[PDB]
């Protein structure tokens, strides 16, 4: 299909790749009589591993010749051809994960800025003031636009330069 | 003042007026004045759940001597949902709903004592307003007999009884747990077992508390 | 208790405590929801 | 003044000025003024769609399931995705988009420049306006309310809008789970309240 | 000219405080080349918190 790939469920080497692991695993657990937890621990992993195979085959990942599932970047490809969960969705997740801690770091420096000596306030955090920021940081996309358009996000031209 | 461990002096920060203050803070966790009033409520709450828990354990136990088919406090959880008729999820999630309401209400009177009875919870002003102490709401609902209204000298004398009876209910309710995990039998069963053959039923003979 | 808090508010303490809250959480998310390649579920 | 929970804050940047204000903004989205202005309108537009929209879900399914009288074609509100007939979803959609976006850009460019969306020469004919900021009035209030109950009427719009928004979200999440219609989800609970609750099925049931 | 305690912005090209606010600790009434003395909360690379400037450079805000 896409890019000369095939869905991993209808792949073949992928099916080798799944059923070659259990063999090497089970031939190993034949050395432990069931009265041993190692007989159970190995068993539980073989059943744990097969779950993910039926998951990867189902979810529709694309395995190339090797049988290993690949991904696809472009929105116009992921979206239209149906699998965007590889990056396109989690690339939104991350930004909200990263910007949240990103923007929660900016407010704290603002709130702790005006004082007698902000320095000791950076070493020793007052967690309540940091908590009020961790709370306030949520919905940073809407709070970033506003510091952006109100003009309070940038520090403008009093920055220092050299020559 | 009759401190615990006589011959010492109380930790210098709390000598003050608290019901049942014996000067016991050997790890010094009252050292934060803002935090102390948070522990004073913490105890009062535990003391009140204790005193209800103990009776809740003993009575079904004592009820079981005459017959009358109750369970022990342990494995009374099963026996109810053994016979069920309503699912476990619906019950535990009605807990969190109704119970969480009280606690999260009980909290914002501790935070700011003014609110919670300003009004606009179904009216009920002054019933929830609180009487101003940490763990004592007072009022119409929580205090139906109108006690703690008349003579204060008699009131401060209850506030002492409540704690001292609470500190004992906790310390006993630690026994109900611990002597269940060892002997595996009810609290009043043990209270008969040791009153019958005191010598071979003692603690050293449970085979758990004293391993070999 | 005054000064025990201020120490617990030092930079390396929170750096330890708060990462060990992520680390633990991110570890256990993988306990119940194992092997998450793509967001498909 | 009523508070969301009686003991907390009423954040500094938020006083009790605007109606439907109980002092709840934990994430502190509105802080600067020229934003709070915006969101207030974003609320009402939601609050207004949600009210109307929910009745599109509620009543038709209610009729059918309240008796034989006028059974709602399209069945449950999520079974009306099907039953287009006359025009294709390709065209009928971009007819909407073009048609709505005319009216709603008119709504924005009013918020931008408050006095007149359109002064009398431009956009031939039409342009009655009679517009105060934040509420259209004019055409959009034909019976001529704002008779002196405004402040109360304002509180009654938001407070019903607040609820229909929140209640709408239930219709989504319920149907996403129980696969039934609202009155099916309704009565089945009202029938036997315990076993038919939430959190006994699929969602908190993960436990 | 400029007065003590009043805030300042510094346009001196070679400096660690160039375009950075500072508070005059003292201004001399003299003919000194560099009369004004400012003070900055920030620290230089050398660890210097104070410096002398010329009137043509210091500007008060
Ligand atoms: C908060 C204090 C509290 C204490 C000390 C106990 C004590 C106990 N409960 Mg219990 N419960 C408590 C709250 C509640 N329980 C229940 C409903 C149940 C049920 C249905 C069961 C228990 C059981 C148990 C046992 C431990 C369960 C377990 O997995 O142990 C391992 C750790 C233990 C005797 C189980 C039991 O009866 O075993 C003896 C059991 O089946 N409880 C509800 C209603 C939702 C509670 C509300 O807070
Ligand atoms: C019987 C139904 C009917 C009705 C109710 C109207 C109503 C109206 N006509 Mg009219 N008209 C009709 C049949 C009708 N017409 C027929 C059969 C013809 C062709 C023979 C015309 C040809 C016509 C012309 C050529 C003109 C009107 C105009 C007007 C408007 C004058 C009002 C005004 O100045 O206030 C202020 C002006 C308003 C428009 C008030 C706004 C009221 C509504 C909400 C506006 C609706 C306009 C419409 C949707 C525009 C899109 C259609 C078009 C672009 C294809 C008024 C809305 C005048 C106008 O500007 O409208 C085109 C005008 O010059 N009429
Ligand atoms: C560096 C930037 C960049 C580049 C080079 C591409 C490249 C591409 N995009 Mg993409 N895109 C990008 C950024 C980019 N995208 C961003 C930021 C967006 C915003 C969401 C989009 C939204 C987008 C849409 C909505 C569409 C594309 C499409 C395409 C394809 C365009 C037609 C073509 O090249 O042959 C086509 C490519 C192939 C025939 C090879 C397919 C490769 C397989 C599926 C993997 C191509 C794969 C179109 C597309 O899907 O093409 C089919 C399409 O409809 N893109
Ligand atoms: C939370 C505060 C914060 C914020 C808002 C930023 C923001 C920025 N940094 Mg940055 N940085 C920070 C802390 C922060 N940094 C720290 C603590 C260090 C190292 C001691 C660095 C080291 C650093 C370098 C070396 C570079 C940046 C760059 C950048 C810019 C591009 C973003 C990027 O890719 O960074 C990527 C971030 C990293 C590589 C390291 C960040 C590690 C984390 C985020 C620091 C921990 C944050 C802190 C614990 C939050 C406490 C919150 C609590 C007090 C409430 C952006 C302006 C880049 C730049 O200027 O490009 C324009 C760049 O080259 N920063
Ligand atoms: C908070 C303390 C507490 C808790 C959690 C429990 C918990 C339990 N008790 Mg219990 N109990 C307690 C204190 C407590 N007890 C005390 C102090 C007594 C002495 C009077 C008893 C006497 C007692 C008996 C005699 C029985 C239980 C039983 C039970 C179990 C089932 C509860 C049930 O079906 O009744 C739920 C019933 C209701 C909620 C009815 C409410 C009636 C009130 C008065 C009106 C409205 C409530 C209002 C908010 C207050 C459960 C393990 C039963 C058992 O062992 O299993 C068969 C049982 O038969 N309890
Ligand atoms: C920088 C590149 C990079 C990237 C993109 C990833 C990405 C990933 N790694 Mg990985 N890894 C990396 C570097 C990287 N890693 C490095 C450098 C190492 C060596 C130390 C590893 C070692 C490693 C192991 C050993 C494992 C992963 C796993 C994973 C996957 C699981 C993510 C997860 O826990 O679910 C997402 C988790 C959450 C969403 C929890 C957050 C929940 C909050 C509450 C949401 C709240 C929203 C409001 C993910 C695709 C795991 C896996 O299964 O991969 C196949 C796994 O077991 N990685
Ligand atoms: C061409 C069609 C069109 C256009 C141009 C707009 C334009 C607008 N709509 Mg919108 N809307 C439309 C169709 C349209 N709508 C339809 C069909 C519906 C469903 C009934 C809505 C429901 C809707 C709501 C519920 C809200 C808007 C809002 C807005 C404004 C902000 C949009 C935003 O944040 O963009 C962000 C950029 C992208 C999404 C890209 C903007 C004026 C918001 C508003 O006015 O806030 C004050 C708002 O709250 N619209
Ligand atoms: C005020 C709006 C409102 C009302 C009147 C109801 C009422 C109802 N919902 Mg419901 N619901 C709502 C909002 C609402 N919900 C929202 C916003 C969500 C998504 C978060 C849900 C998600 C939901 C699910 C998933 C299910 C119900 C179910 C039910 C019915 C059983 C009661 C129950 O479990 O509720 C639980 C209510 C909540 C978790 C939200 C709290 C509502 C607040 C406290 C009221 C004010 C009952 C008719 C169940 C049902 O009918 O099963 C047959 C069911 O399966 N609802
Ligand atoms: C609340 C409580 C008990 C509550 C009982 C309940 C709800 C009853 C529950 C049940 O009825 C149900 C629900 C179902 C029934 O079928 C079964 C059960 C399960 C039985 C015990 C508290 C029990 C709490 C106890 C025992 C605490 C002891 C703490 C001590 C001694 C601390 C001392 C210090 O803290 C100080 C004082 C000062 C510091 O400086 C020094 C140190 C040492 C740190
Ligand atoms: C508008 C809306 C729903 C509209 C639904 C419509 C039109 C339905 C249309 C249909 O049914 C019909 C008509 C017919 C069907 O055949 C077709 C469909 C299409 C199915 C929901 C809004 C839903 C909006 C919701 C649920 C918002 C909830 C917000 C909450 C809880 C709080 C938010 C906060 O902002 C505050 C208050 C303070 C901040 O600090 C903190 C945060 C959290 C940011
Ligand atoms: C309890 C685990 C988290 C550790 C931090 C909790 C205390 S928070 C701590 O409170 C102190 C009160 O004097 C302040 O001095 C200090 O600045 C503040 O960080």
């Amino acid at each position: 299909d896409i890019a000369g790939l095939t869905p991993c469920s209808e792949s073949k080497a992928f099916k080798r790749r799944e059923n070659k692991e259990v063999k090497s695993l089970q031939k190993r657990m034949a050395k432990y009589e069931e009265g041993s937890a190692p007989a159970l621990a190995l068993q539980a992993t073989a059943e744990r591993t097969q779950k993910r195979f039926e998951f990867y085959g189902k979810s529709g990942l694309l395995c190339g010749n090797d049988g290993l599932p690949h991904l696809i970047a472009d929105p116009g490809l992921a979206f239209r051809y149906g699998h965007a969960g590889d990056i396109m969705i989690p690339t939104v997740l991350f930004i909200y994960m990263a910007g949240y801690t990103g923007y929660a770091g900016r407010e704290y420096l603002l709130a702790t800025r005006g004082e007698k000596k902000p320095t000791q306030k950076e070493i020793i955090i007052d967690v309540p003031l940091a908590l009020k920021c961790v709370a306030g940081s949520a919905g940073w996309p809407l709070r970033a636009f506003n510091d952006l358009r109100s003009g309070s996000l940038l520090e403008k031209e009093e920055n220092i330069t050299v020559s | 003042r009759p401190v615990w461990y006589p011959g010492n002096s109380p930790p210098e920060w709390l000598d003050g007026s608290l019901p049942g203050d014996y000067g016991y803070d050997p790890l010094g966790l009252a050292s934060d004045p803002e935090m102390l009033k948070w522990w004073v409520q913490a105890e009062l709450v535990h003391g009140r759940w204790a005193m209800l828990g103990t009776v809740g354990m003993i009575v079904p136990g004592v009820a079981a001597r005459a017959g009358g088919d109750f369970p022990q406090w342990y494995d009374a959880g099963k026996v109810y949902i053994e016979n069920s008729s309503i699912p476990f999820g619906a019950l535990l999630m009605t807990q969190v709903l109704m119970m969480g309401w009280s606690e999260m209400m009980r909290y914002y009177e501790f935070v700011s004592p003014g609110s919670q009875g300003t009004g606009s919870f179904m009216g009920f002003t002054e019933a929830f307003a609180g009487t101003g102490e940490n763990g004592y709401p007072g009022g119409r609902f929580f205090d139906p007999f109108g006690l703690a209204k008349g003579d204060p000298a008699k009131l401060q004398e209850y506030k002492v009884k409540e704690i001292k009876n609470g500190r004992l209910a906790m310390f006993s309710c630690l026994g109900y747990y611990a002597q269940y995990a060892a002997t595996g039998k009810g609290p009043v069963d043990n209270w008969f077992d040791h009153i019958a053959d005191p010598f071979h039923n003692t603690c050293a003979t449970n085979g758990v508390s004293v391993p070999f | 208790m005054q000064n025990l808090k201020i120490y617990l508010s030092t930079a390396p303490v929170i750096a330890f405590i708060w990462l060990s809250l992520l680390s633990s959480l991110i570890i256990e998310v993988n306990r119940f929801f194992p092997d998450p390649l793509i967001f498909a579920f | 003044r009523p508070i969301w929970l009686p003991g907390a804050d009423v954040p500094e940047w938020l006083d009790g000025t605007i109606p439907g204000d109980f002092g709840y903004d934990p994430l502190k989205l509105g802080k600067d003024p020229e934003t709070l202005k915006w969101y207030v309108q974003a609320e009402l537009v939601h609050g207004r769609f949600a009210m109307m929209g929910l009745v599109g879900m509620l009543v038709p399914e209610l009729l059918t399931n309240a008796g034989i009288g006028l059974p709602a074609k399209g069945t449950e509100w999520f079974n009306a995705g099907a039953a287009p007939m006359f025009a294709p979803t390709g065209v009928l959609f971009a007819m909407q988009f073009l048609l709505m976006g005319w009216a709603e850009i008119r709504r924005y460019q009013d918020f931008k420049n408050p006095g007149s969306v359109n002064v009398d020469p431009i956009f031939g004919g039409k342009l009655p306006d009679g517009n105060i900021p934040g509420y259209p009035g004019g055409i959009f209030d034909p019976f001529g309310f704002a008779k002196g109950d405004v402040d109360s009427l304002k509180l009654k719009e938001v407070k019903n809008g607040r609820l229909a928004m929140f209640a709408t979200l239930g219709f989504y999440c319920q149907a996403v789970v129980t696969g039934k219609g609202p009155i099916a989800c309704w009565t089945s609970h009202l029938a036997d309240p315990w076993a038919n609750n939430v959190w006994s099925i699929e969602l908190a049931k993960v436990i | 000219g400029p007065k003590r305690g009043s805030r300042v912005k510094i346009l001196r090209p070679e400096s660690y405080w160039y375009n950075r606010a500072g508070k005059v600790v003292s201004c001399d009434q003299t003919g000194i080349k560099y009369p004004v003395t400012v003070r900055f909360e920030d620290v230089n690379y050398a660890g210097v918190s104070t410096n002398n400037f010329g009137l043509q450079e210091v500007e008060e805000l």
Side-chain angles (χ1 to χ4, degrees):
Chain A
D1 289 343
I2 286 306
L5 300 179
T6 58
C8 299
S9 63
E10 59 182 340
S11 176
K12 290 177 294 298
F14 180 87
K15 182 59 173 60
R16 293 187 183 178
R17 185 59 56 86
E18 304 323 335
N19 200 32
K20 67 176 67 180
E21 297 188 358
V22 179
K23 296 178 184 297
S24 62
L25 188 147
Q26 289 180 336
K27 63 180 293 180
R28 181 179 181 172
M29 69 179 285
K31 296 186 297 182
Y32 292 88
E33 55 195 343
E34 299 302 314
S36 293
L40 296 173
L42 291 170
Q43 182 65 263
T45 55
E47 299 306 323
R48 176 182 177 276
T49 195
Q50 299 178 340
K51 295 175 180 176
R52 83 179 75 180
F53 311 159
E54 295 175 349
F55 183 86
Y56 294 150
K58 179 184 74 178
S59 66
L61 291 177
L62 294 172
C63 289
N65 190 341
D66 295 343
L68 293 174
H70 298 73
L71 307 182
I72 287 98
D74 288 341
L77 304 175
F79 287 159
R80 185 181 298 175
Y81 298 128
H83 48 281
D86 52 2
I87 298 100
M88 299 297 99
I89 289 103
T91 189
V92 177
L93 291 172
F94 170 77
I95 300 300
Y96 176 74
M97 297 292 182
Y100 184 77
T101 179
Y103 180 75
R106 184 180 184 275
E107 293 299 322
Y108 177 83
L109 291 174
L110 298 175
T112 61
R113 177 59 179 83
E115 286 183 353
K116 56 180 68 179
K117 56 180 177 296
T119 60
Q120 63 174 12
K121 203 74 176 294
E122 290 187 351
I123 291 176
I124 297 170
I125 298 98
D126 51 347
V127 183
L129 174 59
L131 290 174
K132 302 293 184 291
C133 178
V134 172
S137 173
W140 63 270
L142 298 177
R143 292 184 58 189
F145 301 166
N146 303 341
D147 285 339
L148 186 146
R149 293 183 181 83
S150 299
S152 66
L153 193 148
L154 271 63
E155 189 178 358
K156 186 185 290 294
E157 292 307 320
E158 61 275 9
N159 305 134
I160 178 171
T161 309
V162 177
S163 179
Chain B
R1 183 177 68 260
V3 300
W4 71 286
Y5 190 75
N8 289 346
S9 64
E12 295 83 357
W13 58 93
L14 57 84
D15 61 353
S17 64
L18 294 176
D21 173 67
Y22 296 126
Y24 173 73
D25 187 5
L27 295 182
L29 272 68
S31 298
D32 191 8
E34 296 174 349
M35 183 175 281
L36 175 59
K37 66 181 68 178
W38 173 260
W39 294 112
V40 177
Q41 186 173 1
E43 174 174 359
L44 285 163
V45 174
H46 286 281
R48 294 186 175 94
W49 288 102
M51 292 186 283
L52 292 177
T54 295
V55 177
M57 285 177 273
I58 295 300
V59 174
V62 173
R65 177 176 181 79
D69 62 13
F70 298 103
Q72 300 304 100
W73 61 270
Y74 63 89
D75 195 4
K78 291 178 178 177
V79 173
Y80 181 81
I81 65 103
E82 297 301 321
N83 300 338
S84 180
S85 65
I86 64 102
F88 176 82
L91 195 152
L92 171 61
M93 293 295 105
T94 302
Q95 179 83 262
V96 177
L97 185 61
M98 297 194 292
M99 178 67 181
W101 180 269
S102 299
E103 298 299 318
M104 187 67 74
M105 178 176 282
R106 176 173 65 84
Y107 173 71
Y108 283 98
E109 187 277 338
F110 172 79
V111 173
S112 62
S115 63
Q116 302 310 110
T118 58
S120 295
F121 172 84
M122 288 186 286
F124 289 166
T125 303
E126 181 276 337
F128 299 157
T131 190
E133 291 79 352
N134 286 129
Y136 309 134
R140 185 177 183 174
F141 294 95
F142 298 149
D143 182 5
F145 283 97
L147 204 147
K149 184 66 170 174
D151 185 8
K154 186 62 163 65
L155 176 59
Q156 62 179 15
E157 192 276 342
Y158 283 106
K159 287 155 56 184
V160 177
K161 293 180 178 296
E162 175 176 355
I163 298 300
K164 295 172 67 69
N165 291 280
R167 307 181 197 283
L168 174 59
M170 300 174 184
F171 176 75
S172 297
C173 188
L174 177 59
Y176 296 135
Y177 297 141
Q179 75 184 27
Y180 162 72
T183 67
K185 194 184 293 179
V188 67
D189 291 344
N190 291 338
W191 185 71
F192 294 166
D193 288 347
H194 188 62
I195 198 65
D197 179 7
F199 307 98
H200 300 83
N201 291 285
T202 186
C203 181
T205 62
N206 65 38
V208 178
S209 63
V210 182
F212 301 99
Chain C
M1 184 59 68
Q2 287 297 326
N3 287 334
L4 183 139
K5 291 180 176 179
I6 300 172
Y7 171 78
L8 298 181
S9 295
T10 57
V13 173
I14 284 98
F16 167 74
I17 288 171
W18 188 88
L19 290 174
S20 62
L21 260 59
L22 294 185
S23 299
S24 180
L25 183 143
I26 302 169
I27 286 173
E28 291 182 353
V29 171
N30 297 333
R31 182 172 182 263
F32 304 107
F33 299 100
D35 301 347
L37 284 178
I38 70 167
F39 176 86
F41 63 92
Chain D
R1 181 188 60 203
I3 311 302
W4 65 281
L5 63 83
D9 287 342
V10 178
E12 296 78 359
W13 58 270
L14 182 148
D15 56 348
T17 298
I18 59 175
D21 177 353
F22 302 99
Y24 169 81
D25 188 354
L27 306 180
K28 187 170 60 63
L29 271 65
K31 179 184 288 181
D32 53 347
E34 69 278 2
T35 56
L36 181 63
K37 300 293 182 64
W38 174 255
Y39 299 131
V40 173
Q41 187 174 355
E43 181 183 6
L44 294 170
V45 178
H46 279 164
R48 293 187 176 93
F49 281 111
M51 287 188 283
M52 289 299 296
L54 181 143
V55 177
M57 295 184 284
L58 188 60
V59 171
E61 185 280 334
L62 188 147
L63 300 174
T64 299
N65 202 339
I68 299 99
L70 186 63
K73 183 180 293 297
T75 308
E76 297 176 353
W77 59 276
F78 62 88
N79 285 282
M85 292 292 109
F86 181 86
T89 187
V91 176
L92 185 146
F93 176 79
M95 290 175 69
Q96 175 182 353
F97 179 89
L98 272 56
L99 189 65
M100 289 296 296
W102 184 266
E104 199 163 5
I105 294 298
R106 293 278 293 179
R107 179 175 63 83
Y108 173 77
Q109 297 299 322
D110 177 65
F111 177 79
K112 184 176 181 178
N113 191 337
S116 64
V117 189
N118 183 31
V119 68
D120 41 347
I122 303 100
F123 180 72
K126 287 171 287 299
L127 54 84
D129 287 343
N131 297 337
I132 67 103
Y135 293 126
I139 289 175
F140 305 99
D141 191 6
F143 291 158
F145 290 163
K147 293 184 171 78
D149 292 346
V150 183
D151 185 6
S152 177
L153 288 174
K154 288 184 177 182
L155 177 60
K156 301 173 79 70
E157 181 184 6
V158 171
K159 182 173 292 296
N160 286 276
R162 298 284 182 79
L163 198 151
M165 290 188 286
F166 180 77
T168 295
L169 181 62
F171 284 94
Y172 296 144
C173 294
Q174 295 184 341
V176 170
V177 178
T178 54
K180 296 174 179 179
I183 301 304
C185 293
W186 165 258
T187 299
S188 181
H189 180 68
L190 174 59
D192 187 6
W194 298 96
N196 299 127
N197 188 28
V198 289
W199 305 354
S200 172
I201 49 101
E202 178 279 336
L203 63 98
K205 187 186 70 65
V206 295
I207 293 169
Chain E
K3 298 179 299 298
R4 296 190 179 183
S6 62
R7 291 183 178 90
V8 167
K9 180 179 288 182
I10 295 95
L11 58 83
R12 184 177 179 84
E14 71 281 359
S15 175
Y16 182 80
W17 299 286
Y18 171 74
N19 282 279
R20 188 185 298 272
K23 184 183 292 178
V24 172
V25 293
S26 65
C27 180
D28 281 341
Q29 182 68 257
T30 49
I32 299 170
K33 180 68 179 296
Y34 297 134
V36 295
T37 64
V38 188
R39 181 178 293 273
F40 305 97
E41 70 282 6
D42 289 346
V43 172
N44 194 27
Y45 289 93
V48 175
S49 63
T50 54
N51 191 34
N52 306 345
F53 290 141
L55 294 175
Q56 296 85 2
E57 296 173 350
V58 166
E59 292 177 348
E60 287 177 345
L61 290 171

